[PDB]
Amino acid sequence: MEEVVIAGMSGKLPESENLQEFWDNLIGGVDMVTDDDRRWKAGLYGLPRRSGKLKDLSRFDASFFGVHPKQAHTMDPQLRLLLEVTYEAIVDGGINPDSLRGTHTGVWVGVSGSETSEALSRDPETLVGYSMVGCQRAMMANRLSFFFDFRGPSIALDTACSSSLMALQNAYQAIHSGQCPAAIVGGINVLLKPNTSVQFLRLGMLSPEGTCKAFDTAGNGYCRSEGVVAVLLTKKSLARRVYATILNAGTNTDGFKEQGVTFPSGDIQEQLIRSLYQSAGVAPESFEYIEAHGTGTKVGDPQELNGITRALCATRQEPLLIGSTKSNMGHPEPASGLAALAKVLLSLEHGLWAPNLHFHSPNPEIPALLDGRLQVVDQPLPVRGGNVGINSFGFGGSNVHIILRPNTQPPPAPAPHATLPRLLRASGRTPEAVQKLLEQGLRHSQDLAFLSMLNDIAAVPATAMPFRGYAVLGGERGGPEVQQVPAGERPLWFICSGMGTQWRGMGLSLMRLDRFRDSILRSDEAVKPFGLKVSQLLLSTDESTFDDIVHSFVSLTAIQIGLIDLLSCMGLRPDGIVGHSLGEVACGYADGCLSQEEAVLAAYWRGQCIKEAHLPPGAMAAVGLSWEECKQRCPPGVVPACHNSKDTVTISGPQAPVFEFVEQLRKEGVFAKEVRTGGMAFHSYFMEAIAPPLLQELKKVIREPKPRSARWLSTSIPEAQWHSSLARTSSAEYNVNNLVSPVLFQEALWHVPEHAVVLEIAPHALLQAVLKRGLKPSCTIIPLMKKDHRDNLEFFLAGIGRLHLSGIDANPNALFPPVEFPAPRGTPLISPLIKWDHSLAWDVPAAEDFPNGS
Amino acid sequence: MEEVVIAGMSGKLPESENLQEFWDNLIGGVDMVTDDDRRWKAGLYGLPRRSGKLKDLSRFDASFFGVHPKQAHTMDPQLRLLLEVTYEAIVDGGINPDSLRGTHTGVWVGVSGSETSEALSRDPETLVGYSMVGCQRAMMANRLSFFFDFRGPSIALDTACSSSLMALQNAYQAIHSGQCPAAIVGGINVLLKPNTSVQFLRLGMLSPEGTCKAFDTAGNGYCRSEGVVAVLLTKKSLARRVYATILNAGTNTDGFKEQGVTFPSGDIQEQLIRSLYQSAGVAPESFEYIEAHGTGTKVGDPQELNGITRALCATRQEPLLIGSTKSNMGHPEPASGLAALAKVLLSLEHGLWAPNLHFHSPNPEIPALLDGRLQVVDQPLPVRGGNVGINSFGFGGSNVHIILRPNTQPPPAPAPHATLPRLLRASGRTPEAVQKLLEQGLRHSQDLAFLSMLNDIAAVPATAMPFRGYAVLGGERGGPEVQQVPAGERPLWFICSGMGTQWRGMGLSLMRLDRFRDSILRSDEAVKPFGLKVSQLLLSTDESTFDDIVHSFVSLTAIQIGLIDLLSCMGLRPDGIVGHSLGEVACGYADGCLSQEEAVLAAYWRGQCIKEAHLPPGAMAAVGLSWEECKQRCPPGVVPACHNSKDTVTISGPQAPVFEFVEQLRKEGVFAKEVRTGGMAFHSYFMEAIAPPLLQELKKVIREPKPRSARWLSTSIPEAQWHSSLARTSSAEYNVNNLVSPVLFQEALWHVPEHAVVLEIAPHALLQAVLKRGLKPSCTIIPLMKKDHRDNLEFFLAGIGRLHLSGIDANPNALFPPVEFPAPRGTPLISPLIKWDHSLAWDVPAAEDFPNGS
Amino acid sequence: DSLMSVEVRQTLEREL
């Protein structure tokens, strides 16, 4: 009752390390079968010289899959290759494999031989026990279920040549019945000992020329080949990527035949095909292509093709295209179904049917090839539309047939959010893997679904993949950044600065993000009744607006609240919060003890009470003196205000004490930074009378307060008063004490741990130099906005990107509108982009480890 | 949506050639594991000396399964044994295998090793191609599907130790979904090369003592064993025999474990058990026995038993019985599930739980064994009632569990038809097989369901099983009769005699049969209005009744019609019909051109017209003269009447011509048999006037006649008049010509073919001596009734029995009321009663054909 | 037999 789709694909086929190399060789018309001594001699025992073999067989990333190096040498090579391509298939689906770690997904593998098992057990005096664990035929599925933590059925089955498609049929029935949510289908074949080829030669099944002349007059046998293929099957609701939908799948057996056990029977195959499409409810006119078994034998090809033309070409009125990938590749026996399925799905993805090789004249015993009812694809011709049938028949008599419907999702309509720059994060075992992923993301910068699945597969722990990277796409600067991430957990800390950081155009560049704009409009409707709206303070800003301190207060708190909201939808939960005056006001929303409206009205009421009453113009000169030397060198009535660092302390007072330290700024090395904000002496004794009018207004907004958390480190309260009744809750008296007390921004900074990642929440990171000398040198400081930046959205996205390079997982897909659930076809492949640590070589059995009759 | 039942069982286990030998060894407490050099040496390579092995491995009936003797030598022995036990399982179900020849039944076999394949391919210069066909792992299922002509899925699967029960689980899902009507589940394991045992020894899994000390403190490993088991699964409506009903079946896998791939996890097993019974809807209180995996390892037994006591023994209030057949037998790896299932089903059939061996003290790490919540069966204790759980866990991590409910059908209530004698037919390859079946049927003569399934499995062609036999059970004579049947088809011919064969008590003994009594009452209601009823002519017969000729006529035709009805429900369709006067009247009902009422009224009207008019008393003297000499030696007005043979001709005439040939009977060798029937000259010139009154009455009964068939050979019409208008239909003029013409019973007999089987339909076979000298000597004449026989039902059943020995298939189950569809439990097993032609010895690989490190 | 038809034709020509 559930729809079953094909979600992922990966493979290793002759002269085809990756699935793309496979496709290229297939459409290139290259003879992937070769005459090389890569496994045994050229023609020993009278064997054919030509065979299809894999490029390499001794490469395995043993540390990733957690196998001991002594156990990896005594493993079946086909199991090592199956582990790697099984990871690559899940990643090709767009699914992180960690989301299937407890589920009931099953594994079905089609194998037919275990030659490594009998090569590794020839000497009973030097045996090891690990050869049983790494080479037994059930372990080809059980090791996959063990590593990926799969709780479903784990079966290895052998059904001769139809073994791989039979596994697909059983996995189909498991998903269709609701037993399993997902499944993995595999198929493996490796040619190691020549005695099996001598057996097939004496049976009469091997061509002397080593060629599958499919549907040809000169066909006299097949050519043996290798291959390791895996696909990922899932229900429709879990699929990020869809290649095709399996309409139906079934099987039968020939039964008794007078001719023999080996001989094919086309009547039972015709019955299987007709019963399948009937039960599926599809008309035979709707087909356009059928991948035949097509092994090239003398008696098998007319039986199969006459069965096809009886089941399908009765009342059709159109030619039916037919092909066979064994003419391009050779015939891997238990892995022939998934290799043909890979060719079909690659042909559907690229829009062109891959041609057949070695087809010159039709077989005269097949009359449908002579009048045009069946047409062999011998040239590349485009895909028009309809269903594709795939059948594979074993020589024992097992018949399997699949009907699948390709997906035809068009590329989406253009949208105004598609012009915004995006983030792309990557991970890998080596720097080259991260470079490959980032450069392929740069090549396809306008493909939104491709970037979404690439961002989805990047959340791997640093112990598994120790190299991470990022690149900002769609911007003007660009540039991949790759570095090695240290292992372990690093705490994330939030620091939000105070006043003096406003400018012309605060956060406009990232007003294009929807969630930031929603937060800004929420703060707008909150201050709307109070004769104010921060939207004109954002868009219609000139120099007559931010010299006011009320507008500066609300335009600081709203921007910090919007940044915290963006970080909260990002998935990030802070471990420690420490602010600075109005930053400490926004720390209430950062901690959750405040909400939007109370924070914005508290900031506006602070500004309103300050602008209501009037006190002598104040100063904020900054001097190059410590905290203790400033108390003894100020005149009476002049108080130190800000304890930023051990060398930077801000003084507060009137103009004549400000003019007093102009002369002492000439003396020695003393800073003469006299930056003021409206000429008002915040954090001073001049506002002891400001609090009682202000406190009255506040009690009407932050009534029934909530207690502060242990993560919030207070900066207006000294350390010995942290347990008092005033500093447990974020009440109205807590906020008015912030204005009348000096900010202690040094003793809060020494409680930050050793390897913390510090995020600065400010419209301009002017506290970055203070935090560098004020914190431990094993900390990372990341700014989020920069004053007078042309595209501040690119600056924000680079901060999120280097947050990925520190070790904190943060998915930038949540910032943008989500992509529709089926990806459109023609989306680029992901499984060729995965690279492993292949610096080591492992043991492979040779031809001398098998009995030669000596 | 369909109920799945276990219908058949067969097996070959250590020291257990048949399933009964297995049961005996199991309850006998015999250690089926031995220390003999039956496969390799005693303790070479440091291997344990003890192992469980089959009794013989080189026996195969190659001609029955149609394999060439050169192909049989290069076959896997385990496939040969699987073919034989697969036939035995179907026969044990009570089902003829020919009724599944076109159906969609599937085959699932659990294998794990193919050592014969690598022993037969060691020398690439002397290879043969047949070793691929007979030893490839897919062929273990494909050869079964090929021989038995099965169209369903044919899969060989390997899932380590749980491989046999996994096949049962998949076959369960196929029947449950409605995909398959029936299925065959197999499991095979054979120990041939010692290198695999050395691998298991180095892994640490083998006990040094070669003992499975299940649930014991001293358990340190398992003992390797052999075994070939097959069961037959079917839907409920097809089952003649039910062992149990599968309530549920399922599987899962352990997934990732910190301890290693090999280590068992009881938590996932507990989850599997709890999910199964929940989905099945059965309470955990309803269980009474669970067959554990019970391999005897140090860390596996506490994990499995603690998982069982968490899933099952939470709120139970009763002890739960637990056992393990590996303590009796050893551990066959991929065939452990079906062997345990065989032990459980044998224990349910015999009413006693088979005890465990080698259990002395409980494992201290299992606290449920120390307080009584789990109880080990170490003594034979009776079966009380409830469900039985069977689990088998592979060492790769595959877990499978079965819930099955035993059938508790009581033996049926006694009935009056159970005292009647029955027929039992048998077939076999040898005379000893037929003798075994007949003597086991004699031992259980009162078991009706057992005899019904034995009669059902006996319909095999003579080319397959050339020895047939029969025995009449419940009679007083008895005696098995065994002979060799000649091959080919033999035509069946019906001959029904005329008058002069009546006696006192015609057919009474077989009035107890229901269909004969129904035919008699149908003829009774037909003649009821005509002031007659043949029931008092049957029961209330004395010597004042059958001296009348009307009663003799109806009591001949009714008995012959009832015999023909019994033969028609028997399944038999005649090839040639030839009668004799009133026999030729009953030939109309034999041919189908007449019905019951027309035949009975025609016979009664012949008698009524004969008894109406009166003619001079006639004679039927019989003389020892030929047909031509009788015409020249009779006086004028005296006509020869019956041409029985070349030496026997009946004369017809008055008393004074009858007295004339008394004197000539003294002369030479002339018979003086003057037997008359009422003193009336039938087949003579004295009844030329009898026909016109008779014809008038007949036109009112056999109006609108039907044409005679080519099988009916006329005896009142000469050969040259066979195409005339009088002899094409069985009209009223056809019957009145029978009375006025001589019967030509010789020229009809020369048209009978060479090897015909002749059946005599008469209440007393007085024509048996005539047919012996009148027919060819290659014909068999079978009488059906004998005059003055004490039990004529036993005489009828012996005729049907020797009809089976001729070659004609005839099932005597149709004569009696049918047996209810589920057979009651305790019905004797059938699969130990099948014997083969095992006079030849085939090749088995030795230990020297494997690499020893030389 | 199936594969023994080659040897069959061989013996046939040997007789021919």
Numbering used by the authors:
A (entry chain A), B (entry chain B): 1 to 854
C (entry chain C): 2155 to 2170
From the paper:
In mammals, fatty acid synthase (FASN) contains multiple enzymatic domains to catalyse all chemical reactions needed for de novo fatty acid synthesis. An ACP carries substrates from one enzyme to another, sequentially following the chemical reactions. In metazoans, all essential enzymes are included in a single polypeptide chain and are arranged into two main functional domains, each carrying out a key chemical process and named correspondingly the condensing and modifying domains. The entire cycle of fatty acid synthesis requires that ACP carries the substrate from one enzyme to another repeatedly. Here, using a strategy of tagging and purifying endogenous FASN in HEK293T cells for single-particle cryo-electron microscopy studies, we characterized the structural dynamics of endogenous human FASN.
During the condensing cycle, ACP shuttles its substrates between MAT and KS via a Ppant that is covalently linked to S2156. To capture intermediate conformations of ACP engaged with either KS or MAT, we combined particles of ACP-containing subsets from all three datasets to produce a single consensus composite map and subjected each wing to symmetry expansion followed by focused classification. This analysis produced 11 meaningful classes, which we grouped into 5 functional groups—ACP engaged with KS; ACP engaged with MAT; ACP between KS and MAT; and two different groups with ACP not seen. In the group of ACP engaged with KS (ACP–KS), an ACP density is captured in two positions attached to KS, revealing different levels of engagement. In one position (the grey density), a clear helical density is resolved in ACP interacting with H68 and K70 on the KS domain next to the catalytic cavity. We modelled this density as a Ppant arm attached to S2156. Visualizing Ppant density engaging with the KS catalytic site suggests that this is indeed a relevant snapshot of FASN in the condensing cycle. Mass spectrometry analysis confirms that purified FASN is full length with major post-translation modifications including Ppant modification on S2156, ensuring that FASN contains holo-ACP. Taking two substates, ACP–KS/dynamic MAT and ACP–MAT/dynamic MAT, as examples, the hot area of the ACP–KS/dynamic MAT substate extends from −20° to +60°, whereas that of the ACP–MAT/dynamic MAT substate is confined within −20° to +20°. This difference can be explained by the fact that KS is located closer to the linker and that the catalytic sites of KS and MAT face opposite sides of the condensing domain.
